[PDB]
Amino acid sequence: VQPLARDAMAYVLAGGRGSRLKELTDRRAKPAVYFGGKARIIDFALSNALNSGIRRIGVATQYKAHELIRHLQRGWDFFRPERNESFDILPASQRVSETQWYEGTADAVYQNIDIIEPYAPEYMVILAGDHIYKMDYEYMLQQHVDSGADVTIGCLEVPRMEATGFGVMHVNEKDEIIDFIEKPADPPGIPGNEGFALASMGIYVFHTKFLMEALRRDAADPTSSRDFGKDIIPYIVEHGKAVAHRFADSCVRSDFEHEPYWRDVGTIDAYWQANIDLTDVVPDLDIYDKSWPIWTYAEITPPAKFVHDDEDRRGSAVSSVVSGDCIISGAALNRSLLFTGVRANSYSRLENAVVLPSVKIGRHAQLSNVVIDHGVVIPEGLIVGEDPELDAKRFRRTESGICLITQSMIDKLDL
Amino acid sequence: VQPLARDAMAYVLAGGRGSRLKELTDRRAKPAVYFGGKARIIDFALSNALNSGIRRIGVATQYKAHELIRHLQRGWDFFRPERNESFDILPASQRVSETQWYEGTADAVYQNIDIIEPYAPEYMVILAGDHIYKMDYEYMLQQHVDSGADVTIGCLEVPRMEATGFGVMHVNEKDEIIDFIEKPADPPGIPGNEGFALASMGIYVFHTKFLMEALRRDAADPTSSRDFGKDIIPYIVEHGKAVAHRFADSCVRSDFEHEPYWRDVGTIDAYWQANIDLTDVVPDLDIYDKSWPIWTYAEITPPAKFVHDDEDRRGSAVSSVVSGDCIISGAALNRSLLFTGVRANSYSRLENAVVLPSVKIGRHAQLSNVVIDHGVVIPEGLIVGEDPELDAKRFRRTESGICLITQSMIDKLDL
Amino acid sequence: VQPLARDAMAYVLAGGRGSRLKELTDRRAKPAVYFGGKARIIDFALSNALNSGIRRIGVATQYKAHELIRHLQRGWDFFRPERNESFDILPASQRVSETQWYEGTADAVYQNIDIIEPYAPEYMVILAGDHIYKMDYEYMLQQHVDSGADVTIGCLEVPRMEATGFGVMHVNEKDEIIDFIEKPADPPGIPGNEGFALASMGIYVFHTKFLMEALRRDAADPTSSRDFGKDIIPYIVEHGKAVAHRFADSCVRSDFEHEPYWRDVGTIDAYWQANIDLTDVVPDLDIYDKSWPIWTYAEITPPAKFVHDDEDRRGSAVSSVVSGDCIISGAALNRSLLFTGVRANSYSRLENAVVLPSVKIGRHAQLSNVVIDHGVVIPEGLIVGEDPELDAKRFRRTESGICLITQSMIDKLDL
Amino acid sequence: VQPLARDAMAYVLAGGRGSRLKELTDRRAKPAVYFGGKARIIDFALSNALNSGIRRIGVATQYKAHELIRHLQRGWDFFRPERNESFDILPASQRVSETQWYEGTADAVYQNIDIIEPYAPEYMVILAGDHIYKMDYEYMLQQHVDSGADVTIGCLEVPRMEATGFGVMHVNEKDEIIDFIEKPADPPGIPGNEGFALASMGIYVFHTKFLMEALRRDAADPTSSRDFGKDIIPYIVEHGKAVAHRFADSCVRSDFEHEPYWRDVGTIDAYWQANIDLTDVVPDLDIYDKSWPIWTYAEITPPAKFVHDDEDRRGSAVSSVVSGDCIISGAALNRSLLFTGVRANSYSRLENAVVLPSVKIGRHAQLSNVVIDHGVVIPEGLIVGEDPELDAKRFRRTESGICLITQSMIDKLDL
């Protein structure tokens, strides 16, 4: 009768550096990276927990967390303990130990047992905080209880050649995990469906009592790298009962999303592509859906504005997504995504451009196939996208020709 | 030393019907009308109160106030009494008398003395809630105390020809009010500056104890129409000391506003004009200003989206202001202001259009010189602005050719 | 898999006058009456909705609603539409019609169909807002869908002699409702257990569109008094499928409540008793429970204080419940319940006293067996509970000797 | 005309360890210590800022700050940047530098200039976060601008023998500071009033642009201990213009406070004394004042309860201050102060006790002259205050005989 989410706590792992995002994560952890016009990556897992009815949330942070923690303080501020709600931001710090850094994803939870236990949740839902996806976690909770698993593991069903970069679960007829392989060159297929493999999402459901004991087990073992994927879960698949949960069974698709949507935006190319795809006529991700909404930190913002329309300049956007507090003054935008606060000035042009909040585009600048970091001021007349060798020397250039542009790159600029 | 706003309470008169806005105010009071892709009209006086440091606000409502009350409840919800802050919504209702109607603007304060006296504010700032303007009321409060006035009245300095439509204050050299005239055919000129007259704003500062006594006198006087403008102030200019405060002295102008901005948007033409002027290259009102911000009710909204770009259709906006959650799909917008939630569809065209929230524009519709009421669905292929005779039969058409369009008029439609 | 409350809207009927509470409800509807030391009666149903997972709430108000509506505005302010939550305060007002009065409890929902249908909830949970009880509405929802009922009705299982004051449901062996009788002299018994009758709590679960259809037909029938209990529900038991849900199956009992707790505090004796019973060593209602908490409007308040300990005066409380911001200065309290803000002064005595917020007790006053209304100032030396004849002349005195004391009564006082 | 607080930012130094409070500050910094029944010490400076109209606040933390940060996050959560309000929590950490420690109170501001400069406040109000006092900083701001000072320093006026423990300002006839001495053996007296000296409160007003340069200068000086009182202020007194502001000129006294109140609660005795003094008939600090309120983090909490009244046990409090959610079950309290959540059980007695939140007193325990730390569980039958030598072996006992009791101390216990 009662939904199990009433008795669950979501615990989000948000310490991931995202080192392949290069300068995009030099000053902020990957869960803090802006995505899709407004939110940050972490808001997706957070919103999944909220919309699934989980109203105790803990977030473990580590690497470069000041921007992430400030976002969480200001955006996720509406939980009240009187209502059996809680939002705990849990950085590694001189608190219960000297340390100041978590030893691994397991240690991220283990060090905060004294926070969890007063709440006495029946269940723990462990979440990667660095992916973009919508999912109703009540489904996994139900499967976990009914299957008697020690751990239920969220898995994507992917073509085996795509699984070579994931931690892959090897399952039997009834989706019980026989073995776990980190990045198999030839991923094991699903029995009776070997064109596909189950790739771990880093979503784990436990009974709290079991998890605490296993965290304590783990923390005593010197063999352990203190990691869910490499230590906790492999021990259980061997000695206990681990079961896979398939993302397709619990993904929340809107009427305007043709397939289950999950993205890890792990490379500059992948991050550019996921954002720019939102400019499509029929985008894979429906950012206009209100049935499974993404909460985030947002301020009252004025509308977007388009000015100038003469023989020489026209401020206008085609095949583009433009946020509030954007003033497109005499600037031509095509196939671009603009976050809030952008100022694009006369005779400039943006094409195939992902523009993070509060960027300024100087008069006459022309930028194609770029990601412009938050707050960058683009000098008047800067050309990007016309000279690959010049662009690669000045900026971080992808082999597929995307330039990531940061303020530090701009400050160094000559010819 | 201490600012006088700490000891003031703002009391906003928000019962105004705005009869000349015709069907724009059929189901909402004038202070509830949307303005500027920014806020509702009432939010300007409320934000002026807030930014001036007044932490006690009351709002008297009357004519058709459901939409207005719900906006106040949801938008103006962050005052806490334990911080000596209060926000009181005061509709005429069976709480102290049967009535269910306020007899006038003086009565709207008078019936609520039992709300005011427990707060014991030293000063009352009585405000009209149906005008768009920015003003720092600390200045009026200083002038009032130092002048020793019984009432201090905010006044616009305007050419006398334009003053024929206002309550007009006749003053001596000291800016003390020696007479008041309701709509003078020949407005009294300011001494030494005869080309201008002081036109009342309906902004009044009193010592609370004095006002409470003047309201009690007024509730007894059978010759009184129970109106601040026509009863309270004239009695004081007669028997006490009334002093005029000029708008230009305390108007808050941003660096991008060439002159003090005040608008009463009292007619459809004036409402259309003030909104459409926000699409100018250098607008009179700076809605991007952050130094004197306008607080309002706002939700997390997705960005605006423009799609399609081929031989036959292109979704794009030129010389226009576009709010979030607008999808401009194959539609051409020019010199238009769109509030949130608009959906404009393929081959439609808007020009010189003020489009309130959640309007839908059907394919192939072409509309020029229009105000479209909140939530209207414009039928595919509807043409407005081509045939004044037909437009005037179907719609509320001003002499200058603005068509106000409501869903009730759409529902009646044929050829 | 997904809880049904996600898809439900709770709709609280809060127009009740509670006329048998006499002067306690002369300026406030019954759901606004204070109960238990802090909350108001309406907060119980509201908190049940919230704790059950229902995040769309409507509250219909009518009789003397200013205090109620201010309570809802300031207390129930944390719902956000972006999260698919809503809290709508729905007074009878000149809005969709002139009226200024709901024709009945069915009409209170019918008039507001235009507010419900934009939310399109799958289920409606219609609640009476004038009872004190705790209940998980997910159980009723499941029974309602699983049974295929047209309406599921919440029912107290009570001894038949106690059911003569209730509207009683006659059921068959499957708890299907075969008849409904308003206040039967000899209430029909439950089959196979005739010592008990099922007494209607005025809680009704419907499929939304079935209810919209029953509401519309009811508004059309001139036979109808426009009432859930005597119009909607009788027709369904006759023409459709009405099923009873027993309170015991879904009451939320803390470990410290020996039985399911339900109270209608319909009379001054019952209100006094239910409150004073909280001073017991083992109270029937556990106001210290945090597993099913009651949300309300609460301000930051200083602690309670006890002053003076000498020959002739000692401020102290025995067998009593004392809220914050109470200063017990030389006053003896025994078996009393004090809401916040009380000032009891030297040489006064309270026994068997229910004391609503911000009451003042003057020096030397002695009061026994009383309910003291919000904000009453008790004159120095007043004696209540000594002389029944004099007490009944001065105050509202019950047959059993409880005096309800209002400020209007105090104002009239001599000897 | 315009108050100066509109353009100030308050910056609270809250990294103080409070070493002399011993185990009371072993797991929290001094600003996080509970005081007076509800608030925490830091809430006084924060409330002074808020009530003075300062809407931008920064709080620098360092030593053991988890509890403090969580308090700030949950309690001080109502500032919105759109209203030009801001509340920044600034712990030393990896962000702008590796360090993760502040080199001193000046470096606590210096490391965060990049947070300050975007706001561009005209004035900085630097505050000590570890003192209990009320003060209207608009007075100090007015004095600063009008005097032309480089730094205006808040100062207590105390008898000279008392000043020997303070940093003392030597002034001339016009309250200009001519020397500064750290703990003078013989404190320089006030000219014309040699019985008194000016003791620095560690409150400093600057022009922001001045301060930013003085900090940059300080961050270059290798002879600098990076301290406001030790390096910044003496430098200015020497080469610039430092002016003293006397606390009596801007202290906020309620009508029930016989003198300006300031306490630093630096020792266990001083902490115990300031709290127990609140049980007085006429307390020096008025915690019931509403004119200058102290905001803090508070939850909805049930009332206090007193039970049992027979010949062997009576739950009651005399000359005591008792917070909500305290159940006094057969326990006798006298001259004690209880924070929320205490459970005192049958036959126990508390005298002269300061009892922090959520303490449980076991049956038959008898405790006199104690501070009991947050959450301590006192064993049944424990006796404290009877045997000085035993009490000092078990607990932290002051020379004056106050025992500080923590759970670690209880956990060691036998006889």
Residue numbers in the entry:
A (entry chain G), B (entry chain H), C (entry chain O), D (entry chain P): 6 to 420
Which text from the study accompanies this structure?
The allosteric regulation of ADP–glucose pyrophosphorylase is critical for the biosynthesis of glycogen in bacteria and starch in plants. The enzyme from Agrobacterium tumefaciens is activated by fructose 6‐phosphate (Fru6P) and pyruvate (Pyr). The Pyr site has been recently found, but the site where Fru6P binds has remained unknown. We propose that the ADP‐glucose pyrophosphorylase from A. tumefaciens have two distinct sites for Fru6P and Pyr working in tandem to regulate glycogen biosynthesis.
